[PDB]
């Protein structure tokens, strides 16, 4: 006797399991069993990943309702789980989407001078260099900062919530309250600071003092920031990560994007198909009882999407595990998800990978592992797959 | 049909595996494959661990052969394996053990000192705080650099080599020879200069100047400075840090030292006892056919001395999962190893842990994990077991 298979299967980021292969030929939607004991059906193949995100009776709000079989623990209130539908229902969508595209003047000079900054640091400090925590995650937090229109000092504080905040556990996190509090707080006075006039937090503290926002909470303008600030961050810190290992791993793929930067977005976008930052498989809660391939799913029970069984999809992206710049359907990939819940910082992930890249291939073009790929140490029990550090010489 | 057992069990260091019982009952020297496909005996009791630790002709030195078989890939230069035998060749055991225990006049004052400060600095930021990154690691930083006679501002950069240098990987790995010869020549210049007068290195200092060691070379002495820094470091950060768990975990045991301090030392040995810090047994190469319980290791063959075998032996350390602080046999565990090679710095690694444990305790009475435990990530591929960080709150 054996148990109900177990996600996640592996918290490797580098690598795809075999085993997602085996699934999707063998049962593209299968039970499975969750870290807190729950079952779900995992969802595997391009055709039902698509389905059910394109299919809102797939709720994401339900997902955190009492009592739902569940993924993991919230390290949110449950409301704010809908924060998209909150914002919404603000009349705050337009305004939000509009200040996290990479749009605004200035801000790819400021990001390309942040990048060429950071690495000018470590060629001065000599090789190995971290490109995780010296790099990426810097980036992230710099580029966040600018985007919120908040101090580039105050970033560090914000961003150390995030190994917790981004749990993927069984249990409540206490830490994850506490940091969720404080950060609220820090979000709120900015609102209240005179100095904050850019960015989101510039725009969300004009409209929370116009008429049309009035019955609008303080509570969800604080919210904002701090859901914008943590996700934006964790998830460009970590896709830029790992999308650096995929790249360095293939030193041809590497050669010919710094001989020809000009095909650095069409890399970009096969490095986030064939990213395996997100861990976990997108959680949706049935609200009707619906058909998936052959299982009718039940409703209250739990869905999870497998962002990496869509993506590496041989019957929609042929050869899936290679990165080809001239597929016919490059941006079909679901690493931004699909449907109601489709990324809002799509483009500013975007550039900022296209960015951070563009400036590494510049500067250090004989970059490379200084260690072993196997030595590489896979964060666990997380939302995200990255390794705590990437050691790297050029 | 399944592959041989593979080593090692597990990187969690807050638990030791039930196979590892298993294996002492049925089979307490056994045949296992080690990271590199090496074939090697695992040996997991207390008698047999005692026999191969005591017995010389299972060689340290003999290890670093080419052609031997591998636990794991060199980190340092093959003829740095026998630095302790160097060291004594060169005359400088007595006085490199003189060096480093705790009795030096102001050095435990210093250590309480510094772990309190680090300690004051934790409670003004607020909870979380990591007790790994922001406490004992920073504590045995400061420790080592106070013993060596070097700066502390220099202990980050040297520490920063560790993550690294104490890898346990299948393959050389480029980065530990980058920061090797680095710390090498910083340890070098150590030497040479003049503001450096006390600690270790300020005794090899005068050492090297004298008739009785002229021809003892600048390479032994600077290799001196790296390794001790680096193992001692490594080992009571480490220890210290899986140390806090396992008292955390304790809540009674964590009040009655807090009530009755006098106890600590007896809680530390026993917090020695059952440790998992070491990652991997310890490496011996047979240099003769010996019997070893019911298998004759053939020479040449690879011995793989489980600490932990030993020190949760029942049959030597009755009930052996519990911290019980009255055993008639308290000291006799194997957590310094035992025979030729027992760990030099026994002593100071023993005044750490007892001090930053009685800093911590006053401080913070009600210290307790500000994370479920399984939610702590455990680095991979590491001479030692230990969380990336250790969140905690009080
Ligand atoms: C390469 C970088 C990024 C990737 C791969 C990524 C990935 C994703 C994915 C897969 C989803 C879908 C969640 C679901 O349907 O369950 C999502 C949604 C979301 N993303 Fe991103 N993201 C990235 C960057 C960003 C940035 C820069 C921001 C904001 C500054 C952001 C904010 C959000 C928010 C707020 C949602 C929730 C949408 C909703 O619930 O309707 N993300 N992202
Ligand atoms: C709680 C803290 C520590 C623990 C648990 C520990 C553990 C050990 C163990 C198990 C060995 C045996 C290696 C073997 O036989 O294969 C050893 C040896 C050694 N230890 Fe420690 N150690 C600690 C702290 C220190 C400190 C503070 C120093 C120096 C400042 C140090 C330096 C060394 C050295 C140089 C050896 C090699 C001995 C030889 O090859 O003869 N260790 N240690």
Sequence with gaps: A?????????????????????????????????????????????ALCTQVLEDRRFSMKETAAAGAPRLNALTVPPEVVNNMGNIADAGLRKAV???????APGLEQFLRDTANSLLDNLITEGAPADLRNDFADPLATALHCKVLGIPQEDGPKLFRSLSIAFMSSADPIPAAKINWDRDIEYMAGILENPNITTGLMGELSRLRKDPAYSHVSDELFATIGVTFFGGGVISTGSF????????????????????????????VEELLRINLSFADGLPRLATADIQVGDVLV??????????????????????????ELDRPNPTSHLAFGRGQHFCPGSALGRRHAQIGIEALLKKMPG??????????????????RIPERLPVLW
């Design 2 to 46: 054996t148990v109900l298979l177990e996600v996640p299967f592996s918290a490797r980021g580098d690598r795809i399991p075999d085993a997602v292969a085996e699934l999707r030929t063998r049962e593209p939607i299968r039970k499975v069993r969750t870290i807190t004991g729950a079952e779900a059906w995992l969802v595997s193949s391009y």
């Design 367 to 384: 970059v490379d592992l200084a260690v072993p790929i196997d030595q590489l140490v896979w964060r666990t029990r997380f939302q995200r």
């Design 97 to 103: 989407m509009k200040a996290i595209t990479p749009k």
């Design 298 to 323: 039940r409703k209250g029970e739990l869905v999870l999407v497998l962002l990496e069984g869509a993506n590496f999809d041989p019957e929609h992206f042929p050869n899936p595990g290679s990165i």
């Design 240 to 267: 830029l990560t790992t999308a650096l290992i995929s790249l360095i791993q293939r030193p041809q793929l590497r050669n010919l994007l710094h001989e020809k930067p000009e095909l650095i977005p069409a890399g």
